Amino acid sequence: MVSQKNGIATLLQAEKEAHEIVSKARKYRQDKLKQAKTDAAKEIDSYKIQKDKELKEFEC
């Protein structure tokens, strides 16, 4: 499950792959958190304005 090696070139493979996975995971996590945050904010804002407007009514 945990294999590795030590050389003067083969290591580049582990370093590249590691950086790729770590970079992708971070980009996805940040992108997901950022995108999600916006959705939540809009949901609360939209629901708040819609609920307040509906409750306020026009007749009163």
d(CA 1, CA 37): 36
Domains of the chain: 1-60 (1.20.5.620)
Q: Are 4 and 13 in contact (CB under 8 A)?
A: no
d(CA 10, CA 4): 10
d(CA 36, CA 54): 26
d(CA 9, CA 49): 60
Cβ within 8 Å of residue 11, ≥6 positions away: 5
